[PDB]
CSV table of C-alpha atoms in Angstrom, one decimal:
chain,number,residue,atom,x,y,z
A,1,UNK,CA,29.3,-9.7,-19.9
A,2,UNK,CA,27.4,-12.7,-18.6
A,3,UNK,CA,23.2,-10.7,-17.7
A,4,UNK,CA,23.1,-8.6,-14.6
A,5,UNK,CA,20.8,-9.3,-11.9
A,6,UNK,CA,17.0,-8.6,-12.0
A,7,UNK,CA,15.7,-4.8,-11.0
A,8,UNK,CA,13.9,-4.3,-7.4
A,9,UNK,CA,10.5,-5.5,-7.4
A,10,UNK,CA,7.6,-2.6,-8.9
A,11,UNK,CA,6.8,-0.4,-5.8
A,12,UNK,CA,3.6,-1.3,-4.8
A,13,UNK,CA,-0.2,0.5,-6.0
A,14,UNK,CA,-2.0,2.6,-4.3
A,15,UNK,CA,-5.4,1.5,-2.8
A,16,UNK,CA,-8.8,2.2,-5.0
A,17,UNK,CA,-10.9,5.2,-4.5
A,18,UNK,CA,-14.1,4.9,-1.4
A,19,UNK,CA,-17.2,2.4,-2.7
A,20,UNK,CA,-20.4,3.7,-3.3
A,21,UNK,CA,-23.0,5.1,-0.4
A,22,UNK,CA,-24.6,2.3,1.7
A,23,UNK,CA,-28.2,0.5,1.9
A,24,UNK,CA,-30.8,1.5,3.5
A,25,UNK,CA,-31.4,1.7,7.7
A,26,UNK,CA,-34.1,-0.3,9.7
A,27,UNK,CA,-37.4,-0.5,7.6
N,1,UNK,CA,34.4,-9.3,-24.4
N,2,UNK,CA,32.6,-6.1,-23.1
N,3,UNK,CA,30.7,-5.5,-20.0
N,4,UNK,CA,27.4,-7.6,-19.8
N,5,UNK,CA,23.8,-6.1,-20.8
N,6,UNK,CA,21.3,-4.8,-17.5
N,7,UNK,CA,19.3,-7.4,-16.0
N,8,UNK,CA,15.5,-7.9,-16.7
N,9,UNK,CA,13.0,-6.0,-15.0
N,10,UNK,CA,12.5,-6.5,-10.9
N,11,UNK,CA,9.3,-8.1,-9.8
N,12,UNK,CA,5.8,-6.7,-10.6
N,13,UNK,CA,4.3,-4.0,-8.6
N,14,UNK,CA,1.7,-5.9,-6.9
N,15,UNK,CA,-2.1,-4.4,-8.6
N,16,UNK,CA,-3.6,-2.1,-5.9
N,17,UNK,CA,-6.3,-2.4,-2.8
N,18,UNK,CA,-9.6,-1.8,-3.0
N,19,UNK,CA,-10.2,0.8,-1.2
N,20,UNK,CA,-11.6,1.9,2.0
N,21,UNK,CA,-16.4,1.2,2.0
N,22,UNK,CA,-18.5,3.7,0.3
N,23,UNK,CA,-20.1,5.7,3.3
N,24,UNK,CA,-22.6,5.7,5.1
N,25,UNK,CA,-26.8,4.2,2.9
N,26,UNK,CA,-29.9,6.4,3.9
N,27,UNK,CA,-32.3,6.4,7.4
L,1,UNK,CA,33.3,-8.8,-19.3
L,2,UNK,CA,32.2,-7.8,-16.2
L,3,UNK,CA,27.7,-8.9,-15.5
L,4,UNK,CA,26.2,-5.8,-16.8
L,5,UNK,CA,23.6,-3.5,-14.3
L,6,UNK,CA,21.2,-4.7,-12.6
L,7,UNK,CA,17.6,-4.5,-14.6
L,8,UNK,CA,15.0,-1.7,-13.9
L,9,UNK,CA,12.8,-2.1,-11.4
L,10,UNK,CA,9.1,-3.6,-11.9
L,11,UNK,CA,6.6,-1.3,-13.8
L,12,UNK,CA,3.9,0.4,-12.1
L,13,UNK,CA,0.7,-1.3,-11.7
L,14,UNK,CA,-3.1,-0.2,-11.2
L,15,UNK,CA,-3.8,1.4,-8.1
L,16,UNK,CA,-7.6,-1.3,-6.9
L,17,UNK,CA,-10.9,-0.9,-7.6
L,18,UNK,CA,-13.0,1.0,-5.8
L,19,UNK,CA,-14.7,-0.2,-2.4
L,20,UNK,CA,-17.5,-2.4,-1.4
L,21,UNK,CA,-20.2,0.0,-0.8
L,22,UNK,CA,-22.0,1.4,3.8
L,23,UNK,CA,-22.6,0.8,5.9
L,24,UNK,CA,-26.1,0.5,5.7
L,25,UNK,CA,-28.7,3.9,7.5
L,26,UNK,CA,-27.9,4.8,11.0
L,27,UNK,CA,-30.3,4.2,13.0
G,1,UNK,CA,-29.8,7.6,21.9
G,2,UNK,CA,-26.2,5.8,23.3
G,3,UNK,CA,-23.2,6.3,21.1
G,4,UNK,CA,-22.3,3.7,18.3
G,5,UNK,CA,-19.9,1.3,18.7
G,6,UNK,CA,-16.2,3.0,17.4
G,7,UNK,CA,-15.1,1.6,14.0
G,8,UNK,CA,-12.9,-1.2,12.7
G,9,UNK,CA,-8.3,-0.5,12.5
G,10,UNK,CA,-7.7,1.7,9.1
G,11,UNK,CA,-6.2,-1.1,6.5
G,12,UNK,CA,-2.5,-1.5,7.6
G,13,UNK,CA,-0.9,1.7,4.1
G,14,UNK,CA,2.0,0.1,2.0
G,15,UNK,CA,4.9,-1.5,1.9
G,16,UNK,CA,7.5,1.6,0.2
G,17,UNK,CA,9.5,1.4,-2.3
G,18,UNK,CA,12.7,-0.2,-2.6
G,19,UNK,CA,16.4,1.4,-1.2
G,20,UNK,CA,18.3,2.8,-3.8
G,21,UNK,CA,21.4,0.5,-5.6
G,22,UNK,CA,23.8,-0.8,-3.4
G,23,UNK,CA,27.5,1.0,-3.7
G,24,UNK,CA,30.8,0.0,-5.4
G,25,UNK,CA,32.0,-3.8,-4.0
G,26,UNK,CA,35.3,-3.2,-2.2
G,27,UNK,CA,37.7,-2.3,-4.6
Z,1,UNK,CA,-33.0,6.0,18.8
Z,2,UNK,CA,-31.3,2.3,20.1
Z,3,UNK,CA,-27.5,2.6,20.2
Z,4,UNK,CA,-25.9,4.4,17.2
Z,5,UNK,CA,-24.2,3.0,14.4
Z,6,UNK,CA,-20.5,2.1,14.6
Z,7,UNK,CA,-18.0,4.8,14.0
Z,8,UNK,CA,-15.3,5.4,10.3
Z,9,UNK,CA,-13.4,3.2,10.0
Z,10,UNK,CA,-10.1,4.2,10.8
Z,11,UNK,CA,-8.6,7.5,8.8
Z,12,UNK,CA,-6.3,5.3,5.7
Z,13,UNK,CA,-2.3,6.2,6.3
Z,14,UNK,CA,1.1,6.8,4.5
Z,15,UNK,CA,2.7,4.4,2.4
Z,16,UNK,CA,6.5,3.4,4.4
Z,17,UNK,CA,9.6,4.9,3.4
Z,18,UNK,CA,12.1,3.8,1.0
Z,19,UNK,CA,14.3,0.0,1.1
Z,20,UNK,CA,17.9,0.1,2.6
Z,21,UNK,CA,20.4,0.8,0.4
Z,22,UNK,CA,21.3,-2.7,-1.5
Z,23,UNK,CA,23.3,-4.9,-1.3
Z,24,UNK,CA,27.3,-4.1,-1.5
Z,25,UNK,CA,28.3,-4.8,-5.2
Z,26,UNK,CA,30.8,-7.2,-7.1
Z,27,UNK,CA,34.7,-7.2,-6.1
P,1,UNK,CA,-34.0,10.3,22.8
P,2,UNK,CA,-32.8,11.1,18.7
P,3,UNK,CA,-31.1,8.6,17.1
P,4,UNK,CA,-28.0,7.5,19.2
P,5,UNK,CA,-24.9,9.5,17.3
P,6,UNK,CA,-22.6,7.5,15.0
P,7,UNK,CA,-19.3,6.3,16.5
P,8,UNK,CA,-15.6,6.8,16.8
P,9,UNK,CA,-13.4,6.4,14.2
P,10,UNK,CA,-11.7,2.8,14.7
P,11,UNK,CA,-7.9,2.9,15.4
P,12,UNK,CA,-5.7,5.1,12.3
P,13,UNK,CA,-4.3,2.8,9.7
P,14,UNK,CA,-1.4,1.4,10.4
P,15,UNK,CA,1.7,3.0,9.1
P,16,UNK,CA,3.0,1.3,6.5
P,17,UNK,CA,7.3,-0.3,7.3
P,18,UNK,CA,10.4,-0.3,4.8
P,19,UNK,CA,10.5,-1.6,1.3
P,20,UNK,CA,12.3,-3.4,0.4
P,21,UNK,CA,16.7,-3.4,0.1
P,22,UNK,CA,17.3,-1.4,-3.1
P,23,UNK,CA,19.7,-3.3,-5.9
P,24,UNK,CA,23.1,-4.5,-5.6
P,25,UNK,CA,25.1,-2.0,-6.2
P,26,UNK,CA,27.8,-1.8,-9.1
P,27,UNK,CA,31.8,-2.4,-9.5
């Protein structure tokens, strides 16, 4: 028989962890 | 002929987005 | 024969990279 | 001192994963 | 001091729910 | 006065939307 249809999209991967602390504030 | 084979994999999962910003910097 | 089954889901992808640096330090 | 401004919107959450397979074709 | 810093980004949210059932199968 | 405090959180992230349809059904 003919091949079946493509499967469905993969699930979305998750967002990453938080970034590093920010830089110093005003002088 | 016999029943056909499975289709291929679905479209790619998308790579995960970047995480949130880090916390504020030091004073 | 009839067509085969749909394919597998797309495979899982890598959760995103760390976020950017945080805000500047508070005034 | 005065309270700071509001932060920005949280990032949009992700779409869900694919739904389940469809039902049998017509009898 | 001067006006405080901006608040945090809004909190991350949940992925969405699974999608609809797929299309009906073949005759 | 003391330093201005952080502002309020930004708007919550929006709830993720539904996923894609599932794959087609079988005969």
